[PDB]
Design a protein around this nucleic acid. Structure first.
Ligand SMILES: [Mg+2]
Ligand SMILES: [Mg+2]
Ligand SMILES: [Mg+2]
Ligand SMILES: [Mg+2]
Ligand SMILES: [Mg+2]
Ligand SMILES: [Mg+2]
Ligand SMILES: [Mg+2]
Ligand SMILES: [Mg+2]
Ligand SMILES: [Mg+2]
Ligand SMILES: [Mg+2]
Ligand SMILES: [Mg+2]
Ligand SMILES: [Mg+2]
Ligand SMILES: [Mg+2]
Ligand SMILES: [Mg+2]
Ligand SMILES: [Mg+2]
Ligand SMILES: [Mg+2]
Ligand SMILES: [Mg+2]
Ligand SMILES: [Mg+2]
Ligand SMILES: [Mg+2]
Ligand SMILES: [Mg+2]
Ligand SMILES: [Mg+2]
Ligand SMILES: [Mg+2]
Ligand SMILES: [Mg+2]
Ligand SMILES: [Mg+2]
Ligand SMILES: [Mg+2]
Ligand SMILES: [Mg+2]
Ligand SMILES: [Mg+2]
Ligand SMILES: [Mg+2]
Ligand SMILES: [Mg+2]
Ligand SMILES: [Mg+2]
Ligand SMILES: [Mg+2]
Ligand SMILES: [Mg+2]
Ligand SMILES: [Mg+2]
Ligand SMILES: [Mg+2]
Ligand SMILES: [Mg+2]
Ligand SMILES: [Mg+2]
Ligand SMILES: [Mg+2]
Ligand SMILES: [Mg+2]
Ligand SMILES: [Mg+2]
Ligand SMILES: [Mg+2]
Ligand SMILES: [Mg+2]
Ligand SMILES: [Mg+2]
Ligand SMILES: [Mg+2]
Ligand SMILES: [Mg+2]
Ligand SMILES: [Mg+2]
Ligand SMILES: [Mg+2]
Ligand SMILES: [Mg+2]
Ligand SMILES: [Mg+2]
Ligand SMILES: [Mg+2]
Ligand SMILES: [Mg+2]
Ligand SMILES: [Mg+2]
Ligand SMILES: [Mg+2]
Ligand SMILES: [Mg+2]
Ligand SMILES: [Mg+2]
Ligand SMILES: [Mg+2]
Ligand SMILES: [Mg+2]
Ligand SMILES: [Mg+2]
Ligand SMILES: [Mg+2]
Ligand SMILES: [Mg+2]
Ligand SMILES: [Mg+2]
Ligand SMILES: [Mg+2]
Ligand SMILES: [Zn+2]
Lengths: 208, 68, 157, 105
RNA sequence: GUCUACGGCCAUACCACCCUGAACGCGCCCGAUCUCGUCUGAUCUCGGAAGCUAAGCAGGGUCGGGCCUGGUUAGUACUUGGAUGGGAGACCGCCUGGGAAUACCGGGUGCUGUAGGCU
RNA sequence: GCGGACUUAGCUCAGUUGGGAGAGCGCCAGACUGAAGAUCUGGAGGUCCUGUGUUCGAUCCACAGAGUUCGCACCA
RNA sequence: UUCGUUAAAGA
RNA sequence: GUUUCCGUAGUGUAGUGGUUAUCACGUUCGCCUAACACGCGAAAGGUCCCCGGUUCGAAACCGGGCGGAAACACCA
RNA sequence: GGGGAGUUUGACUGGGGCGGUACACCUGUCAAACGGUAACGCAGGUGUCCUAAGGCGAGCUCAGGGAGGACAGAAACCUCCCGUGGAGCAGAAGGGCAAAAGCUCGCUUGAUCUUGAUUUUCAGUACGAAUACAGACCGUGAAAGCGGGGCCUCACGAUCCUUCUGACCUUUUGGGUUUUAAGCAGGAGGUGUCAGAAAAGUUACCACAGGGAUAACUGGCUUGUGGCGGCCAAGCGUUCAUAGCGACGUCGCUUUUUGAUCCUUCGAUGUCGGCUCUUCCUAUCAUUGUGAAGCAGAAUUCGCCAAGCGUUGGAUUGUUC
RNA sequence: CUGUUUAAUUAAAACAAAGCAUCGCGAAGGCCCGCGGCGGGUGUUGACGCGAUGUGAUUUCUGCCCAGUGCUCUGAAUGUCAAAGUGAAGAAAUUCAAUGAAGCGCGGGUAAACGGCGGGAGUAACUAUGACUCUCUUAAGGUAGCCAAAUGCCUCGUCAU
RNA sequence: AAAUGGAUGGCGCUGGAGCGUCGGGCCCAUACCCGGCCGUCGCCGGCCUACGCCGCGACGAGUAGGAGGGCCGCUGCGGU
RNA sequence: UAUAGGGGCGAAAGACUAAUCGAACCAUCUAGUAGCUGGUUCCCUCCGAAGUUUCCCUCAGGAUAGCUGGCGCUCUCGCCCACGCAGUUUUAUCCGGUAAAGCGAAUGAUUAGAGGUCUUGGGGCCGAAACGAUCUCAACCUAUUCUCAAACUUUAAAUGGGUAAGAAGCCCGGCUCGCUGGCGUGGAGCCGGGGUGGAAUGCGAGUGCCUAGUGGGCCACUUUUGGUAAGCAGAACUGGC
């Protein structure tokens, strides 16, 4: 386990786990949702998300420790099934290690220069969302404090933003309450199906 | 004793030291490299032009000079 | 050290683009390739019998020889020393015409028509292609409405 | 590989396609009293040791099979050579195969 | 206003389902003695013409799927050239120029050449 | 490249001035003995390395080839 | 021709 | 660390010239014996290291890991 | 027949050797949308296979899925429908291909002879490979046409010498015949270090010309590793996060270790340890002055100003340790 | 053991040594010198001698393997094997065929000749240890002795002094 | 927090000689303009050493290297 | 007195053999050869580089190409308008598949929830058992949704590459052909005639011979490969040492 000071801002092309890598071990994170996974859309109105500022690489172990800290503060503040946290970020870039000393100069110079896979990190663009927590209206400050506790644990500088959208959907919270009732949006689990008007008439007849 | 392998640095400047040249001068293009059946057309056409062009072209030139 | 074989960089270049695979169209064949025709080179993936080379894709040359079911084109290729006129034999499926010479012949026909009109009526024509001139002292109009005032917007994430 | 016994190929004597007996080319015994052989014997006779070099580091394992084609027609006797590419095993003239054969391993 | 034979552009012309088809034409169909090739006149060939538009086919329709085109995305992401610009870096801002795409929305869905026949 | 030798039952071997395959050890089943071994009897097991040619018939004749081995010679 | 072992006691 | 090789019933192995679960020891049942050793006849016992790709078909051909066995790691 | 003689010990290489071939040729990426463009870069190959897997013509459509049908099951055979390439085309990939370049069937060797041109690597040399022609003899098809190997990208080889083939060829030396020998044209025998020498090791007894183009000390860049701090706090501390600690993560400092590079030094900077001796730093072991404890006293622990002064005698090991 | 040696960095555990062995040789010979001669050294010598080797007083022993590499013995019964000689064809050069001297092979001996000497598994009333047994295996499987040695990486092995 | 004592160049600087935005002046290089002179090159004038004499214009750095001129020099030979 | 140089002699250290011994000394071949060090002698003027392609037992070297100099030759302006050229732009005309973007689009990964019911598999429940029937998990499908791809891609930039912008070009009339062929059909060649004012800016061009040096490079903005990073190693454009 090498420090995160030597694996930082992007200096290589993305090298994913594929047909040509074949040697990367398992990532640290395996799951990506921690809260009420079966939460409906009208249950938790708002969401606060965590916006990066530096074009950096976040490691999977950092994502692990941050989601554990955020989950722990959420279950100590609003308890189980009072929140829904989703790590938006998924690690795919495989960093490499060129290890030596396997106190001698008589084993290997820079002869075999290409390295073996060490672990998985995640290339993060400027403005790309790290995490997103949807909660009730009364849990506004708790999401702020949870992502603030994750802020001290991610490297680099990043900000927090309470979204204008209604949860994880791409539609506005101002338009949601006035527009899901009349015509368009129908809830489908935790996601929302948006229907256009360019359908067959059997869909409109199945509605109403 | 490792040396520098290959580069193309300081090459286009040496190219443009002397003004990169189009061949730029081919009037009556070179005839080799063309279909030998077409050559059996054209060479026999040329030598029978050398043989039998005289009187008809001469009278035609006289006619167009008289009408012009 | 790149192992410079034939077509070692042609994963995308000699490929039929999208929704255009299958048999070759016959209007590619049914064309008039005389001598002196300034024609382009664009390689094909269906017919493998007449690929020019990966270096001559997209270039433009002059026809010198025509055969049964191919054509011969002289192409200026640039090498390390200087550009060279090279004599290639390319099949008909890889070749289309170039419309720049056709536009120049259209301009020549229009210039001959304007010169005939000039000799007829004594009218000066200005048959030289002058480039895009500077804008003349034209006169704008702002009737009916005041000009709309634009201001920059505040920053919102 | 497999080549047949007979083959109808252009022979240069009569200038028509005629059938040819196809046989394997033996290299042939090297004859004495040739030019380079007498020169090498003259150069070898004396206290000089091995004068011309001798080949050591062989790397190819196959030889190009060349075929002697003889004209089958009488009083022509046109014999010539046709080379094939490099092959390891070479069947002479028999045992053609089919597609409906059982594997029967 | 159409079809047949050969086509050019290769989905504005493909796929799913439902209606319409007067007259030539296309077809389904009607049988193996010769030409014919099969386990099978199912396919391909041979002389038909009793019915039929049920099907192909030709039109139209689907708040149809796809395809093409136009807005939006967006003067955004990118980007030629420049600075003794900012920042520890990460990168970002400015001058001069060029400028894309998915979502979202709107419109169309065949055009024709040659030869021939129907109203 | 030259000359010469050996390929047989599961194992070791025999078998021409060619009419064709056996011995021993193996396996199975009987008998003998109070039981084993030896013994006696009866079974099973060969593509005789492969292809071709002569002969009516080839393990044995010849040719070519496939594995093993013995010396010998080496102008690219 | 070969064929191994069977304690403590119990009259 | 590098280069070769191996992984198969509880144990040591054979087996690819792709398309089996093979031998030997051990366990259980029954026999011979007065009863044990010895002997006999069966039976069970296999993830062919784990996970993937090739094909009609893989343990076999190949790859990534896992755990081992040999050889080298020298001059300053 | 090393008793003696002569000669050789490939090249690349983050020093040499071992390891490997990046030494000949291919595929995709690096490669920055013409092309070219490096490393012992990445992932994978090749020294073969094929008388058909060549050439032509004709017929048919594949992989997979759904529904049925005696034994029949997950896979045995038949039929119907969906089936744009999800199969196959000899092999490593890329491209390309559907009345097809795929599968089956029928005939055939064009995988034949010969002179030029052009493309590829490129110096616009060669080999290899390829393309369009041309002249004979042919295959297929009804004809159109297609075919002078493999659907394309690789699958291979100079001089000299040997061997074979051809003309009813030339010279065999003063002239004839005949054997032989030489030549002309094109196939083979091969240079894998693949534009091609015929080649084992050791030298600590070594020598010469050189190199800091090139290692072994220090010094220089970096800090992977070592050492030493900080940040957020899930928990330890009977209670209680922060008296003392602190995981999961994360930001740094130093050159007291080791590693990486080769910048200077090869017409030499004398290369370990110890003895003696001077000076400096603080990341403080004690002493001076203080803050905090789970500080009752004592004894400890954690911090601050602080390097002024001290920081031992010995048994072992050449020791650093 | 006394002795000897890297004069000008070593004085030794190095060399020599008596003892123990082995091999060649009966002189037209063994081992050697020489460009040459039946020329020379051993030789004015004759197996208790000469020449060439390993080990190194005395005591006690000299384990087992001829698979390999050498050395040596033996046979035209027998493969291969060069000139010269023989036979045939031809006008001849030339070609072909048989026979074959040493050597190699075929058979034996030789380790005080060079040399070499195993890894697994299960098994005795607590446990370990395992006389014992089974399997693959070589030519033989390290025997008598000895030891972390001047010979042991782990290792500053474990116990005692 | 780092080893000899030491580095915004030092001295010093706080109503600035620090920081950020700027304004007006000021200082200079072999850079630019004008002018004098040398040389090279280009174009040219004249029937005044023609190998000399003027005329106009533009430019002059440079290792390896390549040319041209030398009324630079040393030694000897024939003329002078 | 005897042993004299690849010889002698050695109780063996390769020790001694006239201060020299892992092969003595003197002379000759011999001024041995060296791709390897060091050096290379007057002035001024003018021009003035390369560390790169390919090949070699090639890697400290050489050959070839490139960069450079010298010597010229063929021409042209010099009295409404000549030809030609360009590290440049415009006008058109084609070419690409990188940045970007996308995967509710193919290939490959990957997250979570919902709806549906053919399916076999784990549970209890209606109960002699029953695809007679019920719930849930399993898996599948549908419509969504999260995150990517140097060896993925529908779309697709900026930058860039080729071509044309005339008198060597247009148009008309005719002869030849053994090529081709319904055709005086097509296509090439040849002959004669008529009209040059045909984008912007700049520039006087073309061509022949001989040859030195070079063949160890480095740095910087930007685009980038390996490495944690390096004043590290390796590439591209331009500039500089
Ligand atoms: Mg170089
Ligand atoms: Mg001679
Ligand atoms: Mg001789
Ligand atoms: Mg019939
Ligand atoms: Mg019939
Ligand atoms: Mg019918
Ligand atoms: Mg119909
Ligand atoms: Mg109908
Ligand atoms: Mg329609
Ligand atoms: Mg639609
Ligand atoms: Mg910029
Ligand atoms: Mg008893
Ligand atoms: Mg020698
Ligand atoms: Mg080397
Ligand atoms: Mg490119
Ligand atoms: Mg480019
Ligand atoms: Mg169908
Ligand atoms: Mg492929
Ligand atoms: Mg494909
Ligand atoms: Mg077909
Ligand atoms: Mg032909
Ligand atoms: Mg030597
Ligand atoms: Mg020593
Ligand atoms: Mg010595
Ligand atoms: Mg560390
Ligand atoms: Mg260096
Ligand atoms: Mg160094
Ligand atoms: Mg360097
Ligand atoms: Mg010095
Ligand atoms: Mg000193
Ligand atoms: Mg000194
Ligand atoms: Mg002090
Ligand atoms: Mg001494
Ligand atoms: Mg004697
Ligand atoms: Mg003794
Ligand atoms: Mg012994
Ligand atoms: Mg003889
Ligand atoms: Mg015997
Ligand atoms: Mg023997
Ligand atoms: Mg036990
Ligand atoms: Mg022992
Ligand atoms: Mg200061
Ligand atoms: Mg200021
Ligand atoms: Mg100068
Ligand atoms: Mg000598
Ligand atoms: Mg001396
Ligand atoms: Mg010496
Ligand atoms: Mg000597
Ligand atoms: Mg000299
Ligand atoms: Mg200059
Ligand atoms: Mg070479
Ligand atoms: Mg070199
Ligand atoms: Mg040098
Ligand atoms: Mg040169
Ligand atoms: Mg010049
Ligand atoms: Mg590309
Ligand atoms: Mg991208
Ligand atoms: Mg020179
Ligand atoms: Mg050099
Ligand atoms: Mg560099
Ligand atoms: Mg400069
Ligand atoms: Zn013939």
């Amino acid at each position: 386990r090498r420090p995160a000071r030597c694996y930082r801002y992007c200096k290589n092309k993305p090298y994913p786990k594929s047909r040509f890598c074949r040697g990367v071990p398992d990532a640290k994170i395996r799951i990506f949702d921690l809260g009420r996974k079966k939460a409906k859309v009208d249950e938790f109105p708002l969401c606060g998300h965590m916006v990066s500022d530096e074009y950096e690489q976040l490691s999977s172990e950092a994502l692990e420790a941050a989601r554990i800290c955020a989950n722990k503060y959420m279950v100590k503040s609003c308890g189980k099934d009072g929140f829904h946290i989703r790590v938006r970020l998924h690690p795919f870039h495989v960093i490499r290690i060129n290890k030596m000393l396997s106190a001698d100069r008589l084993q290997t110079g820079m002869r075999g220069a290409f390295g073996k896979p060490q672990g998985t990190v995640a290339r993060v663009h400027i403005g790309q969302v790290i995490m997103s927590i949807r909660t009730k209206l009364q849990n506004k400050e708790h999401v702020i404090e949870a992502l603030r506790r994750a802020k001290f644990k991610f490297p680099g500088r990043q900000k927090i933003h309470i979204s204008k959208k209604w949860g994880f959907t791409k539609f506005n919270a101002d338009e949601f309450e006035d527009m899901v009732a009349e015509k368009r949006l129908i809830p489908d689990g935790c996601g929302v199906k948006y229907i256009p008007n360019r359908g067959p008439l059997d869909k409109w007849r199945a509605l109403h | 004793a490792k040396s520098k392998n290959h580069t193309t640095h300081n090459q286009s400047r040496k190219w443009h030291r002397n003004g990169i040249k189009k061949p730029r001068s081919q009037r009556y293009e070179s005839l080799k490299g063309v279909d030998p059946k077409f050559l059996r057309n054209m060479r026999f056409a040329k030598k029978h032009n050398k043989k039998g062009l005289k009187k008809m072209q001469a009278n035609n030139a006289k006619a167009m000079s008289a009408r012009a | 050290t790149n192992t410079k074989g034939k077509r070692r960089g042609t994963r995308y270049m000699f490929s039929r683009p999208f929704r255009k695979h299958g048999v070759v169209p016959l209007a590619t064949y049914m064309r008039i390739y005389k001598k002196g025709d300034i024609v382009d080179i664009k390689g094909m993936g269906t017919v493998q019998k007449g690929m020019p080379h990966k270096c001559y894709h997209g270039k433009t040359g002059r026809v010198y020889n025509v055969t049964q079911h191919a054509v011969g084109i002289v192409v200026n290729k640039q090498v390390k020393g200087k550009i060279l006129a090279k004599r290639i034999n390319v099949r008909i499926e890889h070749i289309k015409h170039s419309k720049s010479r056709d536009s120049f012949l259209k301009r020549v026909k229009e210039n001959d028509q304007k010169k005939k009109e000039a000799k007829e009526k004594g009218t000066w024509v200005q048959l030289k292609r002058q480039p895009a001139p500077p804008r003349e002292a034209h006169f704008v109009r702002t009737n009916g409405k005041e000009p709309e005032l634009l201001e920059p917007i505040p920053y919102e994430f | 590989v497999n080549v047949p016994k007979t083959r109808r190929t252009f022979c240069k004597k009569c200038g028509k396609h005629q059938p040819h007996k196809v046989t394997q080319y033996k290299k042939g015994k090297d004859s004495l009293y040739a030019q380079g052989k007498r020169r090498y014997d003259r150069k070898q006779s004396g206290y000089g040791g091995q004068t011309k070099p001798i080949f050591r580091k062989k790397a190819k394992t196959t030889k190009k099979i060349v075929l002697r084609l003889e004209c089958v027609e009488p009083n022509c006797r046109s014999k010539r050579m046709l080379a094939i590419k490099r092959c390891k095993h070479f069947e002479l003239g028999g045992d053609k195969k089919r597609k409906g054969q059982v594997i029967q391993f």
